[PDB]
Amino acid sequence: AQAAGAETLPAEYAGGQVARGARLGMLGNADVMDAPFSITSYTARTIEQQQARSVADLLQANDPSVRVVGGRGDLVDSYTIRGFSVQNADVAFNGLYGLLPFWRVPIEFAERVEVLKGPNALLGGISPGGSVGGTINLVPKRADDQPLTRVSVDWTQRGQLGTHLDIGRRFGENNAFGVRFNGVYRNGDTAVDHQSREFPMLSLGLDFRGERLRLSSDLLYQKESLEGVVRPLLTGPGTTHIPHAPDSKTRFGLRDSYLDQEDYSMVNRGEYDLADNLTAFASIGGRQSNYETIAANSILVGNQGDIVNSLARQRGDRRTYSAEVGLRGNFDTGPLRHDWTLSANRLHERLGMVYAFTGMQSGNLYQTSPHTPLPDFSSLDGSIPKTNETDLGGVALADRLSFLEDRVQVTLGVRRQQIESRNYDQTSGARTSHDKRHVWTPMASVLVKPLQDLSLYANYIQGLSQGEAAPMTAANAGQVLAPYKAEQYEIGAKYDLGGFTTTLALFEIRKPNAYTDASNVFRADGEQRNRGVELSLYGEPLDGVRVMAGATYIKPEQNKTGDPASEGKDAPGVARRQANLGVSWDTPFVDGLTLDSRWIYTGSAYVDSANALAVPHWNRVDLGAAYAFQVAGKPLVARANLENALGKDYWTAANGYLSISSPRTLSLSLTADF
């Protein structure tokens, strides 16, 4: 069947650090040179080589277009992509939303971590968090035919001890069935003052390989428990400048904070080839997410480095269902080949989320905080009441027209997207809001291959975000606005020299934003207009020398505000320049030895809409090494990764707050295949 390849895992590219292709949502997997989008897919090889544990670890080290807000000391990572914030809750799982750990995705069970840059509502529907900067997609591990019995042990500053089992088996006639299990247990003191972390994780990738039938089921369990929670530093009404970043080992937030975050999910997927030119597919999954924390956000007071920590307890019970069904077919109209996809999806979520802010405790950026009182938060004990219900569902039809022996490709699609949410007050249980909307959202793209190894492309595509509720201060307080429609135009070029590829892209993304005006009326009358250029090179351009290099330049314009002080200024939290350079070098002179280095750069950015508060540019250097050897006939690999090797301390800017950098962090690991 022609559509039977939609879920086929893309081959690794030269060097094995990235893959040749990635998911285009409802369209399934596309080769990089057939994709009229900027897509990058990082491999398990890279994940294991750099000892990346989370999406954030991997993406900020390697990708010129992804920067992380929060960080591994915090309970939550978020990602900025093409000048827009992308929630970790909007990370996709084989294209499906709502099924991965809500605050921080671990990737030690991942075969691929893909980045599709820019919005993609036509391809995937709306994301639960409304993100539009890009879609990160995780592809889970599957069992290969040759059995895998892999064990590794690892140490990470200051005392985190870990073990990782990666076991794969196939069985049944013709290895029709596969089982891949990943188990991680990592526990101990982190690199940050007075912080410890416990991390159990279990995953099973199950699949069935049949003549006209393909099935899979993914089960995931994970918990992250932190003693000590790093949190944002907020700007105050009279902040005049951003103080110099403290030592990243210092922890200036709530000393006796804690996080207990548990997620588990199951997702079953299938395809069935009804004919040579018709394939049915369906997915159904669910996720439970349990959230418990007491922590404090730091607020600048004065400008000498004093802070006040604002304490809170938060509790969450989130229950998500996420499903898709559809058909993929193909036919011809003369010289046109049609490859069409009809897809429908549905996400349904029930959330209980209670919180109480109590306590304001003085501190200082440059002092690890002392033990301070924890307020009585017992009124949140017991059952967590329902506070929100979300229902997203859509139907999409897309057609890829192939002309002139597939050297010209035109893709058209439209999706009808339904959005519905209901909110209930955490104390009274009163129904505070019921938002219900539908929107149509289209795409158009064209790709031309003048050379076999040169692809030129353009796309138009939209992003969708649920409208915001007006703050309980404005004239229309509580009213939640119409959905925000972001719009992207992109053009680019991709050139595949065989062992390495160079890409270029120019994009614009326009998105409405909401502010309270002079009439204290909350309206969606603002607009952000991000215009950017992206360049990258990746591959193995010399034998035994792999290179991933990229840079981006963006003008992130607040091109419509209700304010002259901010009109035309830069969106906060969006550096105009970012670049990454990674080199991995198989030394010709030591057998089995590989040396890695990375340089991450982020230019100056602002925290405020008026741009009166700039944060400096920053640089991070990583050093790595891998040593492959044999003992008793079995392969072993010893690894070392030194993140932030120079021990630089820096702020990452966001809109209204800053996240402190993670300190210099060595991890060491030994892996054996039995």
Ligand X SMILES: CCCCCCCCOCCOCCOCCOCCO
Q: Of ligand X, K ion, ligand A1H49, none, which one does residue 234 interact with (CB within 5 to 8 Å by kind)?
A: ligand A1H49
CA proximity to 219, closest of 200, 199, 205 = 205
- Which CB, 104 or 569, lies closer to ligand A1H49? 104
Report the relative pairing of strands 278-300 and 306-333 from DSSP bridges.
antiparallel
Is the backbone peptide bond immediately before 158 cis, with ω within 30 degrees of 0? yes
Could you say whether residue 295 binds ligand A1H49 (CB under 6 A)? yes
Tokens of 289: 């997410």
The phi, psi pair for 432, rounded to 5°, reads: -95, -30
- Which CB, 101 or 352, lies closer to K ion? 101
Contacting K ion (CB under 5 A), which of 224, 317, 570, 622?
A: 224
∠ Cα 500 506 511 (to 5°): 135
Place of tokens 């607040």: 558
Q: Of ligand A1H49, K ion, ligand X, none, which one does residue 152 interact with (CB within 5 to 8 Å by kind)?
A: K ion
The stretches of 473-573 forming alpha helices (DSSP H) are none
∠ Cα 462 24 18 (to 5°): 125
Could you say whether residue 195 binds ligand A1H49 (CB under 6 A)? no
> Taking a C-beta distance cutoff of 8 angstroms, is the pair 652, 658 a contact?
yes
3-state secondary structure of 92: strand
Residue window 250-289: x/- pattern of binding to ligand A1H49, with contact defined by CB under 6 A: ----------------------------------------
Binding segment for K ion among 173-181, 216-224, 299-307, 507-515 (CB under 5 A)? 216-224
Q: Of K ion, ligand X, ligand A1H49, none, which one does residue 57 interact with (CB within 5 to 8 Å by kind)?
A: K ion
Distance of alpha carbon 472 from alpha carbon 646, whole angstroms: 46
The phi, psi pair for 129, rounded to 5°, reads: -80, -5
Distance of alpha carbon 668 from alpha carbon 639, whole angstroms: 6
Binding residues for ligand A1H49 restricted to 53-82, rule: CB under 6 A: 76
Could you say whether residue 282 binds ligand X (CB under 6 A)? yes
Binding segment for K ion among 317-325, 514-522, 533-541, 657-665 (CB under 5 A)? 657-665
Could you say whether residue 312 binds ligand A1H49 (CB under 6 A)? yes
Could you say whether residue 423 binds ligand A1H49 (CB under 6 A)? no
Could you say whether residue 297 binds ligand A1H49 (CB under 6 A)? yes
- Which CB, 234 or 307, lies closer to ligand A1H49? 234
In the complex, the smallest distance separating the C-beta of residue 652 from K ion, rounded to whole angstroms, is: 8
The phi, psi pair for 445, rounded to 5°, reads: -150, 155
Could you say whether residue 657 binds ligand A1H49 (CB under 6 A)? yes
> Taking a C-beta distance cutoff of 8 angstroms, is the pair 20, 10 a contact?
yes
In the complex, the smallest distance separating the C-beta of residue 94 from ligand X, rounded to whole angstroms, is: 12
* Burial track 317-345 (b if 16+ CB lie within 10 A, e otherwise): bbebbbbbbbbbbbeeeeeebebbbebbb
DSSP string, 204-273: EEEEEE-SSEEEEEEEEEEEEEEES----EEPPTT--SPPPPP-TT---S-TT-EEEEEEEEEEEEEEEE
Could you say whether residue 562 binds ligand X (CB under 6 A)? no
Q: What is the CA radius of gyration of the chain?
A: 24
The residue number with the shortest CB distance to ligand A1H49 is 295
Binding segment for ligand X among 5-13, 148-156, 380-388, 453-461 (CB under 6 A)? 148-156
CA proximity to 501, closest of 535, 538, 534, 533 = 538
Could you say whether residue 208 binds ligand X (CB under 6 A)? yes
Contacting ligand A1H49 (CB under 6 A), which of 21, 64, 70, 232?
A: 232
Place of tokens 């981006």: 552
Binding segment for ligand X among 108-116, 206-214, 350-358, 378-386 (CB under 6 A)? 206-214
Binding segment for ligand A1H49 among 24-32, 85-93, 191-199, 292-300 (CB under 6 A)? 292-300
Could you say whether residue 514 binds ligand X (CB under 6 A)? no
Give the DSSP letter of residue 633.
Answer: T
Distance of alpha carbon 481 from alpha carbon 515, whole angstroms: 11
Q: Of ligand A1H49, K ion, ligand X, none, which one does residue 489 interact with (CB within 5 to 8 Å by kind)?
A: none
In the complex, the residues that contact ligand A1H49 under the rule CB under 6 A are 76, 232, 234, 293, 295, 297, 312, 314, 355, 656-657
Residues making contact with K ion (CB under 5 A):
54, 56-57, 71-72, 74, 101, 104, 106, 124, 127, 152, 154, 164, 224, 230, 644, 659-662, 669
